[PDB]
Structures are given as structure tokens and as C-alpha cells.
Design a protein around this motif. Sequence first.
Motif, PDB file in Angstrom:
ATOM      1  N   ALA A  25       8.648  -4.991  -2.643  1.00 38.78           N
ATOM      2  CA  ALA A  25       7.422  -5.275  -1.601  1.00 38.78           C
ATOM      3  C   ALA A  25       7.291  -4.005  -0.756  1.00 38.78           C
ATOM      4  N   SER A  26       8.272  -3.331  -0.434  1.00 35.85           N
ATOM      5  CA  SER A  26       8.222  -2.071   0.216  1.00 35.85           C
ATOM      6  C   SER A  26       7.528  -1.241  -0.479  1.00 35.85           C
ATOM      7  N   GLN A  27       7.682  -1.091  -1.876  1.00 34.54           N
ATOM      8  CA  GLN A  27       6.989  -0.324  -2.917  1.00 34.54           C
ATOM      9  C   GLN A  27       5.548  -0.665  -2.922  1.00 34.54           C
ATOM     10  N   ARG A  28       5.163  -1.839  -3.083  1.00 33.62           N
ATOM     11  CA  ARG A  28       3.841  -2.422  -3.110  1.00 33.62           C
ATOM     12  C   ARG A  28       3.111  -1.908  -1.695  1.00 33.62           C
ATOM     13  N   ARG A  29       3.839  -2.036  -0.484  1.00 33.07           N
ATOM     14  CA  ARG A  29       3.297  -1.685   0.967  1.00 33.07           C
ATOM     15  C   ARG A  29       2.869  -0.079   0.676  1.00 33.07           C
ATOM     16  N   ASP A  30       3.843   0.755   0.182  1.00 36.66           N
ATOM     17  CA  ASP A  30       3.512   2.067  -0.127  1.00 36.66           C
ATOM     18  C   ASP A  30       2.400   2.221  -0.684  1.00 36.66           C
ATOM     19  N   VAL A  31       2.229   1.498  -2.169  1.00 34.99           N
ATOM     20  CA  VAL A  31       0.960   2.024  -3.097  1.00 34.99           C
ATOM     21  C   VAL A  31      -0.290   1.509  -2.273  1.00 34.99           C
ATOM     22  N   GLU A  32      -0.449   0.239  -1.451  1.00 35.80           N
ATOM     23  CA  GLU A  32      -1.304   0.121  -0.692  1.00 35.80           C
ATOM     24  C   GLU A  32      -1.858   1.106   0.589  1.00 35.80           C
ATOM     25  N   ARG A  33      -0.889   1.822   1.160  1.00 35.69           N
ATOM     26  CA  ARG A  33      -1.326   2.576   2.223  1.00 35.69           C
ATOM     27  C   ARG A  33      -1.524   4.070   1.654  1.00 35.69           C
ATOM     28  N   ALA A  34      -0.831   4.309   0.271  1.00 35.76           N
ATOM     29  CA  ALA A  34      -1.193   5.395  -0.387  1.00 35.76           C
ATOM     30  C   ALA A  34      -2.618   5.543  -0.932  1.00 35.76           C
ATOM     31  N   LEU A  35      -3.272   4.320  -1.538  1.00 33.08           N
ATOM     32  CA  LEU A  35      -4.464   4.423  -1.906  1.00 33.08           C
ATOM     33  C   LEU A  35      -5.391   4.337  -0.666  1.00 33.08           C
ATOM     34  N   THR A  36      -4.963   3.923   0.143  1.00 32.26           N
ATOM     35  CA  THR A  36      -5.603   3.750   1.466  1.00 32.26           C
ATOM     36  C   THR A  36      -6.071   4.890   1.917  1.00 32.26           C
ATOM     37  N   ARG A  37      -5.159   5.762   2.186  1.00 28.10           N
ATOM     38  CA  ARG A  37      -5.050   7.331   2.596  1.00 28.10           C
ATOM     39  C   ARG A  37      -5.995   7.954   1.628  1.00 28.10           C
ATOM     40  N   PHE A  38      -5.962   7.595   0.394  1.00 29.20           N
ATOM     41  CA  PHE A  38      -6.732   8.512  -0.617  1.00 29.20           C
ATOM     42  C   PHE A  38      -8.163   8.201  -0.124  1.00 29.20           C
ATOM     43  N   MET A  39      -8.706   7.098  -0.438  1.00 26.87           N
ATOM     44  CA  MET A  39     -10.157   6.692  -0.352  1.00 26.87           C
ATOM     45  C   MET A  39     -10.555   6.786   0.982  1.00 26.87           C
ATOM     46  N   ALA A  40      -9.442   6.842   2.072  1.00 28.70           N
ATOM     47  CA  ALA A  40      -9.783   6.941   3.304  1.00 28.70           C
ATOM     48  C   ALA A  40     -10.356   8.397   3.649  1.00 28.70           C
ATOM     49  N   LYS A  41      -9.509   9.536   3.338  1.00 26.95           N
ATOM     50  CA  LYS A  41     -10.032  10.824   3.235  1.00 26.95           C
ATOM     51  C   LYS A  41     -11.168  11.112   2.200  1.00 26.95           C
ATOM     52  N   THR A  42     -11.252  10.034   1.150  1.00 30.43           N
ATOM     53  CA  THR A  42     -12.146  10.620   0.197  1.00 30.43           C
ATOM     54  C   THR A  42     -13.824  10.432   0.506  1.00 30.43           C
ATOM     55  N   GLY A  43     -13.896   9.247   0.841  1.00 28.24           N
ATOM     56  CA  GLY A  43     -15.363   8.525   0.818  1.00 28.24           C
ATOM     57  C   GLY A  43     -15.966   8.622   2.179  1.00 28.24           C
ATOM     58  N   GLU A  44     -16.805   7.770   2.420  1.00 28.20           N
ATOM     59  CA  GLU A  44     -17.516   7.921   3.637  1.00 28.20           C
ATOM     60  C   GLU A  44     -16.811   7.098   4.643  1.00 28.20           C
ATOM     61  N   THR A  45     -16.419   7.876   5.892  1.00 28.61           N
ATOM     62  CA  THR A  45     -15.296   7.225   6.643  1.00 28.61           C
ATOM     63  C   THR A  45     -15.990   7.076   8.029  1.00 28.61           C
ATOM     64  N   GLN A  46     -15.704   5.885   8.605  1.00 25.69           N
ATOM     65  CA  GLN A  46     -15.903   5.781  10.149  1.00 25.69           C
ATOM     66  C   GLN A  46     -14.751   5.173  10.710  1.00 25.69           C
ATOM     67  N   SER A  47     -14.673   5.443  11.863  1.00 23.21           N
ATOM     68  CA  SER A  47     -13.423   5.362  12.555  1.00 23.21           C
ATOM     69  C   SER A  47     -13.286   4.209  13.361  1.00 23.21           C
ATOM     70  N   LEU A  48     -11.973   4.323  14.056  1.00 23.31           N
ATOM     71  CA  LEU A  48     -11.632   3.302  15.282  1.00 23.31           C
ATOM     72  C   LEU A  48     -11.894   4.105  16.536  1.00 23.31           C
ATOM     73  N   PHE A  49     -11.294   4.961  16.745  1.00 26.27           N
ATOM     74  CA  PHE A  49     -11.474   6.101  17.863  1.00 26.27           C
ATOM     75  C   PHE A  49     -12.455   7.041  17.514  1.00 26.27           C
ATOM     76  N   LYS A  50     -12.435   8.111  18.240  1.00 24.57           N
ATOM     77  CA  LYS A  50     -13.296   9.177  17.688  1.00 24.57           C
ATOM     78  C   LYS A  50     -12.387  10.241  16.783  1.00 24.57           C
ATOM     79  N   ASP A  51     -12.614  10.607  15.850  1.00 28.06           N
ATOM     80  CA  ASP A  51     -12.184  11.414  14.761  1.00 28.06           C
ATOM     81  C   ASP A  51     -10.522  11.265  14.662  1.00 28.06           C
ATOM     82  N   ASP A  52     -10.534  10.105  13.662  1.00 25.19           N
ATOM     83  CA  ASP A  52      -8.955   9.868  13.232  1.00 25.19           C
ATOM     84  C   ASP A  52      -9.283   9.879  11.773  1.00 25.19           C
TER      85      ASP A  52
END
Lengths: 52, 187
Positions: A25-52
Motif C-alpha cells: 500500500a505504501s508503494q501504491r501511495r508512492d506511484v500515486e504521488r509520482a504520477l501526480t508530480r509528473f503530470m503536475a509539472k507536465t500539463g496545464e497547472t493551476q495552484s492553491l497558493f501562488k506559484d506552488d
Amino acid sequence: XXXXXXXXXXXXXXXXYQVLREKAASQRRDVERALTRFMAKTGETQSLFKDD
Amino acid sequence: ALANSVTPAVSVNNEVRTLDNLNPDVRLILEEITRFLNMEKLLPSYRHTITVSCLRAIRVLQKNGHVPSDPALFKSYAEYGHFVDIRIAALEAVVDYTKVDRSYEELQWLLNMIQNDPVPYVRHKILNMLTKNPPFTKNMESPLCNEALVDQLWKLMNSGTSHDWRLRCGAVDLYFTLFGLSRPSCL
């Protein structure tokens, strides 16, 4: 026996149930956050604060 | 449940503004909801229902001042080419935004989109839960409806609303709640 006879090595039991599913389950959480970080910096990004 | 982890009292003085990268468990909740929003951007499982609950969670986070009171996310989920339910929850959110925060401009935007969009059911639900959850509440008029907002609202009761009955029925509900049985204290 230390010279003449021999034995066999299997050497990997690793059967700790709750620890096993913690690993999976920890590894599943890892792959979650990994693909999140990837398409996070990849595509169209809007934030919560300014410039995160 | 994470949205019902309401923590109103972290920012004692000014902690709204990337200051702590605000702390500490709030950030963990942010990590999880960020994950699920991007998962349902990738997986999407069934109506973006997860995304809907996420959007409610993010607004409740704005209602405790942790991620700042900024609508532009929800604004970017009230857009055209999404699902209804996403859009409908974003509109509930931005209605409470214009309730507590005093954004005149997004209210004007909201009414312009009440006028202008093709989907009926969003107009239905904008006006329904706008009336259930009003800003500009009658005889509590700090944000000054009397200026020209009564004018445009009277127009939208008259004009632009011969499309359907119930849209101007909702506008009737608007003038019920906002300044019902009287002159609006204009003249």
C-alpha cells in the motif's frame, strides 16, 4: 559436518502479513504521488497558493 | 471526512499566504486531495464524484483561511466543457464565496452566465442554491445592491428570461429574498 556434508539455502521467507500489505500500500501511495508530480509539472497547472 | 476536519483557528494573525506552507496536518490533507484530484483527472471514476467532494473540501479549506479565499480554481471548474455535477458543485462553492467574501465582480459574472450558457439545469441550480444561500441579504445591505444591481436584476426578471418560466420564477425568488415586499431603499 562443516567440511563433509552440505545443505540447501532458500534464504527468503519475508512472510510478515501486515508488514507485507504495508509495503504494497505504501508503494501504491508512492506511484500515486509520482504520477501526480509528473503530470503536475507536465500539463496545464493551476495552484492553491501562488506559484506552488 | 477530511472536509469535515474543519480547522478554523490556525492563522492567528496572518498565516494565509504560503507562510508556513501552512501547517501541519492541513498540508497532509492537501496532499491527499491533490492526489485524488489528479487521479480523477487521470482515472476518472464515475462522474468525477471524487472531484466533486474534493471541490467542497477545498472550499471548506477556504472557509478556514488556509488556502486563501480565491475563486479562480472553482471559477475554472464552473467552465463549459466539464460535467454537470462538477460544474454544479463549483457553482454552489462560488455562491458561498460571494456570500461571505464580498466579490462584486464574480457575482456580476454569475448573473451574466445565468443569462448566458446553454445548459438549463445549471441555471436552475444557480438560482436555487443562490436563493438558498444568498449574499446581499435583505436589510443587511453592506455590499450595496441599491447601486445598479437592483436594476440589472429587474432587467433579468423582465428581459433575457423568456427562455423558460422557471428562470424568472427563480428571479422572483431572488427578489423575494433580496428586498421582498418593498422599495429596495433606492428612491
